[PDB]
Every structure is written in C-alpha cells, then in structure tokens.
Amino acid sequence: GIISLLDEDEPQLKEFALHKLNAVVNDFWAEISESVDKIEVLYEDEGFRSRQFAALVASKVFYHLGAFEESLNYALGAGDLFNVNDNSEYVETIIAKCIDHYTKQCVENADLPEGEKKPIDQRLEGIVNKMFQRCLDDHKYKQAIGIALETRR
C-alpha cells in the first residue's frame, strides 16, 4: 500500500514515493504492477516533472511484466539518462530491443520510398552515436560498418 500514499496531487510526494521506488521496487514488483494506470497518470501529467522517472520505473515494472513494446514506449519516455548507463541486465537489453526497433525501422523505412517515415523520437540515437564512438575508438570498424549494414542507409 505504497501508492495509496499518493492522494496528494503535488509531485513532491511522488518524489518521496519515487524515493521508495529506488529502494524496494523488487520487493514491490507485485505492488507496482497494479499502480500502472496511475503511472499512466504520471506520464500523462506534464506538470509531473518527474515523468521521465515515471517512464523509468514504468519500463522497469514493464520489463518485469514482460511488456517490451511498452517498455520501448516508456524506454523512449525515460529521457537522456537512459542511454548513458552500462548495466549488463536491463539497459543494454532494452537498447538491444530499442535499436532492434531502430534497425527494423530502418529496414521498414529503407523499403519506404520518399520519406513518410516513423520519426526518430527524441530519445533515440544516443548509444548509436555513443557506443558507435566506443567502436570507432576501438579502431575496429567492423561494428562501425555493422550499423551501416543495419540501417541500409
């Protein structure tokens, strides 16, 4: 009952519940999974300025619940701290599936003549031009030509 402690509509108590989210989410993966609609309320509210974090633990409990297209949608809503991490279980898999979506998107739009594409949403391309720089600065451009294969572009 950690989400019923949120009847206050200011985001500053959502900050303290989020405080609970960075601590005991794994013990509360049951508990968060009924909260999803209110997390939707956290994502639909633009005045809730921690909506990046709403998409973060949204894609954590969707990552646990096995939503992955919605872990992709709120993987996109997570913001800029998304791509920079080097976690070996969560973030490299959801950018493996996110960039899987990017490369099937570039195959789909590579088959789609003269634009009319699904746009690059505002949190793409980060580990593209970051881990791509790791592979340029590895001086092994087999990965760097690997993305060029993966985009057909």
């Binding site: 794994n26 993966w29 049951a30 070996s88 279980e89």
Partner: protein, 472 residues
C-alpha cells in the same frame, strides 16, 4: 582407509562423465539438451545426498578437495594424464597421512584450476568447480565454523551468478546445465541464508536472478526461482501474493516433473490461504496425483497432512489411515482426532480438540481452519440432511442440531440458498420449511455436453502423443 576408496572411485566417476563427459557434451552439442551428463551429474547429486557426499569425515579429514581441484588445463591430449594425476594421488589417503585442507583452504583452491591456466571457455567447468567441491559442504550445518563457509562458499556461488550472466559474451546455452545446478544450490542458498534469519537482499539476488532468465534463457530458471520466491513470501507474511495474480507467467515446459508437482502444491497453498475451495482442492488433487513415488518418506506425509486441510474445510473428507505412516501416526494423534472432531457434530468436542492441540495447530499455523470450521460443521449437517429429505422442517434440523429458534434456521436456509446447495424454500408463516430434493433434473444431453470436454480433453492428450512422437 578401506572405505575412502569408495569416494575416491565415485568422485572420479562424477567428474569423468561430468567434466570430460559433459564438457564434451557442451563443446558443440545441445540443440536442446545433448548434455545427458548434466542430468547424470544431478543424479550423482542425489547420490551424494543419499550417501555422504565425499569427505564430511570419511575416516579422515579433507582429502579430495585439495586433491582434485587442480590441474585440468584443457590442453594437448596428454590432459588425460592430468586425470592420471587425479587418480594416482590416492596413496595419500591410503598410505600417507590425511590433512585438513577444506573449509579454510578452499578459498584459493577455487581459484586454482583458474590459476593452473586459462583452463577452458565453458562456464559449467567453473560452476562444477564451485559446486561439486562446495555442495558437499552445505549439509553439515552444525552452525559452528561450517555455516559461515556455506555462507562464503555460496558467495562464490554468487560469483557463479556473476560468472553466469557475464559468460560467453552472451547466449551460449549452458544455463541448461548451470540452472540445472542453479536450481538445487539456490535452494541451498535460501536454506543457509534462512538457517539463521530471513533473507532480505537475497530477495533482490533472487529478483535480478529471475530477471536474467527472462527471455534469453527461459530454461529451468523461472520456475525454480519462482519456487524460491514463493517460499520466500510463504515463510514471510502474506503481502506479495498478488504478484502471480498480475504476473501469471508461471508455465515452463515443466521439465523437472517434481518441480511442477510441488510447485502446484505451493500455489495450491497460496490459493488455499487466500480463499478457495474448489480450485485449491483440485490442485491439491493434481499435485497429489503428481506426487512422484514413495522414495522419500515424510516429505509427502507431512506435506499431505497439510494437503487435505481445505478438504477438511469442505466437510466431505475421509480419514487418511492408508496415507498414515505409523511414524506419522504419533504426529497425527491430534489430526486423526481432528478429522474425528470434523465428522462428529459435537461442539464441546469441536472446541475440545482445538483446546487440546492448539499448539499442534500452531505448528500447522493455518488458523483459517477454525474460523470456518464451525461453519463447516453447519454446512456438513445441512448438506447431509438437505441431501436426505425433500420437505424437512427447519424445526426438525434446528432443535436436533441445537439451533433453539426458527429465525436463525431461516438464516441458515437463506445462506444455504445463497451458497446454493438446495432449492429449499419456506412455507412462510413462522418457518417450517417446504422444500424439495432435485431429481428428474436431467441426465442425457448434459453428460454429452461434458463429453465435449472429456474428448476435447482426449484430443489434447492425442496431440500430446503426437508431440511425444516428435522426440526421437
């Protein structure tokens, strides 16, 4: 000195087929699972659980683990001579003096076949190297210089999670060996971490350990870690049981065939303790008929003392005397008498057995039995008598079953209609039920309605036989 040749022999037979055998069954094999020495090695784990493992004492102290942990090297084909080095060191126990190099000297020994050479690529040699020495140690929990080494040795098995999720630059399918070990030993984890207290960060170890077996290796992890999670929330209080109510993904191929049995028993206890009769008792039934053999005494007996408690709460229960081990008889002395108090309609007996063995009912720890067991008395009486007579009066059943008034009997009839046992009305003046049984109800189409599920169920089993034909 003549008995320790038997662990000398069976030890070498273990890492022969397992080390060389399952490593040879792991180099390029296992389209699904060609590593039959995985399951063979687990059968030798059961052999080490039947027998003493290797060197708990064995007339000496600490012989095999300083010996065999070295010198694998995975090199040029004179590494069978390294196995000859393994074999020809057995004049130390036979001729020489044995010495203490376990539980204290294992801490570099676990590094030693890694410090012989960059030994080999596959992680089942490493989990073999941190399991097959260390799993012989977990079963001596005399809580004195032996549970801290279970603790630390399973910190090395936490380094086998670390050397499980971060090995083969991702997705060589040695979990289909290693989760075959990381089932068993992880239970030992939640044994030894719960030999002292509740585990709270091993909860998280279990959580992320469930998350790594999500999709890339959904093989033997999710169900066994699911058991650890279930018995975690079960040994602890009832708060996180809505997890399966929202994250019902509890369905593997059910390979272990006992894991699925006792697992469905465990969620049978879950739905039992929430509130359920029918689904609960039919997975008590299904897990009961999936109870493997009589090859482990007591573990079916006490668990089946706990199995039929919801059927004790049905009111329609027979007395388990053919289930009764006579060693269980002295422990079912409350329990024989408990179901004796169930079928007897006495009230002073009903509170007299509870009064007599509330301590054993605390050992049960499931006092939802007593909050609805008096209710089960009145439902058994109304089921029996309502089953018997078409038009009984409520005064007939009432002041026979000591109800002393017509109106609470009308409340019994009311909540019996509400619970839906019989279509008993009341010749409504002051009570005095006018009612009926229910025959000439129907008997012909209604069975062949069920035969859709009988024989659609049969064609289910048919295609289970066709897919069973897909095996060789």
């Amino acid at each position: 000195p003549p008995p320790p040749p038997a662990p000398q022999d069976v030890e070498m037979k273990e890492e022969a087929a397992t080390g060389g055998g399952s490593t040879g069954e792991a180099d390029g094999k296992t389209a699904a699972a060609a590593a039959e020495h995985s399951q063979r090695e687990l059968d030798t784990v059961t052999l080490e659980d039947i027998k003493e493992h290797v060197k708990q004492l064995e007339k000496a102290v600490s012989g095999k683990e300083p010996r065999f942990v070295l010198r694998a090297l995975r090199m040029l084909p004179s590494t069978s001579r390294r196995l000859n080095h393994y074999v020809l060191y057995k004049a130390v126990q036979g001729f020489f003096t044995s010495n203490n190099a376990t539980r204290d000297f294992l801490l570099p020994f676990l590094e030693e076949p890694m410090d012989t050479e960059a030994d080999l690529q596959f992680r089942p040699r490493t989990g073999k190297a941190a399991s097959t020495p260390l799993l012989p140690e977990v079963e001596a929990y005399l809580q004195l210089l032996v549970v801290i080494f279970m603790m630390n040795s399973k910190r090395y098995k936490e380094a086998q999670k670390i050397s499980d999720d971060l090995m083969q630059k991702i997705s060589t399918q040695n979990r289909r060996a290693l989760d075959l070990v990381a089932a068993k030993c992880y239970y030992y984890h939640a044994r030894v971490y719960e030999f002292l207290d509740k585990l709270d960060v091993v909860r998280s170890f279990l959580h992320a350990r469930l998350r790594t077996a999500t999709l890339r290796h959904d093989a033997d992890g999710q169900a066994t870690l699911l058991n650890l999670l279930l018995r975690n929330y079960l040994h602890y209080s009832l708060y996180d049981q809505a997890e399966k109510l929202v994250s019902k993904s509890v369905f593997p191929e059910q390979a272990n065939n006992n894991e699925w049995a006792r697992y469905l028993y465990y969620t049978g206890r879950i739905k039992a303790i929430q509130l359920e009769y029918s689904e609960a008792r039919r997975t008590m039934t299904n897990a009961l008929r999936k109870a493997p053999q009589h090859t482990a005494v007591g573990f079916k007996q006490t668990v089946h003392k706990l199995l039929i408690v919801v059927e004790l709460l049905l009111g329609e229960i027979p007395d388990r005397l053919q289930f009764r081990q006579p060693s269980l008889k002295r422990s079912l002395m409350p329990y024989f008498l408990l179901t004796q108090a169930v079928r007897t309609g006495n009230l002073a007996k009903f509170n007299q057995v509870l009064d007599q063995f509330g301590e054993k009912f605390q050992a049960d720890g499931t006092y939802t039995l007593i909050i609805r067991l008096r209710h089960n008395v009145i439902k058994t009486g109304v089921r029996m008598i309502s089953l018997s007579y078409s038009r009984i009066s409520l005064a007939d059943i009432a002041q026979k079953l000591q109800l002393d008034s017509p109106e609470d009997a009308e409340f019994i009839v009311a909540k019996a209609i509400r619970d839906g046992v019989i279509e008993a009305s009341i010749n409504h003046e002051k009570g005095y039920v006018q009612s009926k049984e229910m025959i000439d109800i129907y008997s012909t189409r209604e069975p062949q309605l069920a035969f859709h599920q009988r024989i659609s169920f049969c064609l289910d089993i048919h295609n289970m036989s066709v897919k069973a034909m897909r095996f060789p």
